[PDB]
Ligand binder design. Structure first.
Ligand SMILES: COC1([C@H](NC(=O)c2ccc(C#CC#CCCO)cc2)C(=O)NO)CS(=O)(=O)C1
Ligand SMILES: [Mg+2]
Length: 298
């Protein structure tokens, strides 16, 4: 039968702090009707300001992916969106009491746990996918982000950081067969000490600590208990790309390859894709058995 749209089965509540703002924030995830998409709702404002998590609403892409509507922003959406994408949630309202999603432990792990504890609900409408049919590339200097046709969903990333902690970093994950939860969800964000005074002077990384980030000095990881994966850095790049890519508003059938890319170039890739309507089409699957991707039991 049809691959169906999914929402949350129960409401999820969490409390935390913004990575960049350091502000205390209350998060509530709620079920939503078919074809809603993921919508962020600033419930601290009167009237409540609602910003769909779509490429067209992205404003800043400096350190994190920020959604903007007028002078209202929702910062650092990428880790929560990665969790939504990885678990195949189409529709949800994300209520926030402040301008930034809580950082939690720096990864998507707490979000996938909270969501999977609440359970998902399959809905009575076909899931829509955006299928890549032509190569679409954006470049800026030595950075590159590309979509390639691929019968499934796969993300590759290569980073060239000149830094002792890497002993070149590259990974490729095929989710049409390897699972977001186990391969990527637990990969934490990271920051270099050389940047933190500068960042904090610009009101960035104000909530950052060893509790919610891999902190790297000149030569080593400062976190007492070390890394969750040997290649945690590049796995986090992949986590970020999955989230930024979900700003398309539908799951992808295709391959993403990133080369020193980040939030700004990821968003540029989506905008270029959306503009080139020869490069993609919207599809559904009336038989899950012949589809190129699958999802975990809800
Ligand atoms: C821009 O850097 C990335 C970004 N993370 C951050 O900007 C970022 C993450 C953590 C910190 C920190 C810290 C700290 C500390 C202790 C001293 O106060 C500072 C910045 C992030 O994960 N955005 O989603 C994208 S990435 O290269 O994969 C990591
Ligand atoms: Mg990140």
């Amino acid at each position: 039968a049809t691959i169906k749209q999914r929402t949350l089965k129960n409401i999820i509540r969490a409390t935390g702090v913004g990575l960049h703002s350091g502000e205390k924030v209350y998060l509530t995830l709620k079920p939503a009707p078919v074809d809603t998409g993921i919508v962020f709702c600033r419930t601290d404002l009167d009237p409540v300001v609602e910003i769909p998590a779509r490429a067209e609403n992205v404003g800043e892409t400096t350190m994190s992916t920020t959604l903007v509507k007028g002078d209202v922003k929702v910062d650092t959406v990428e880790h929560l969106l990665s969790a939504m994408a990885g678990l195949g949630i189409d529709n949800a309202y994300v209520e926030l009491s402040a301008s930034e999603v809580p950082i939690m432990d720096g990864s998507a792990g707490p979000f996938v746990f909270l969501i999977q504890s609440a359970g998902l609900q399959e809905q009575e409408a076909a899931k829509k996918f955006v299928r890549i049919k032509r190569e679409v590339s954006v470049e800026e200097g030595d950075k590159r982000a590309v979509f390639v046709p691929f019968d499934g969903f796969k993300v590759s990333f290569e980073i060239d950081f000149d830094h002792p902690v890497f002993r070149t970093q590259q990974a490729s994950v095929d989710f049409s067969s390897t699972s977001f939860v186990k391969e990527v969800s637990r990969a934490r964000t990271f920051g270099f000490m050389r940047d933190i005074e500068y960042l904090r002077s610009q009101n960035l990384a104000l909530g950052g600590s060893v509790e919610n980030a891999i902190v790297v000095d000149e030569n080593r990881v400062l976190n007492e208990d070390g890394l969750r994966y040997e290649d945690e850095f590049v796995k986090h790049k992949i986590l970020d790309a999955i989230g930024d890519l979900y700003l398309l508003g539908n799951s992808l059938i295709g391959e993403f390859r990133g080369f020193k890319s980040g939030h700004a170039l990821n968003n540029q890739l989506l905008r270029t894709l959306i503009a080139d309507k020869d490069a993609w089409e919207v599809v559904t699957f009336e038989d899950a058995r012949t589809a190129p991707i699958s999802y975990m039991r809800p």
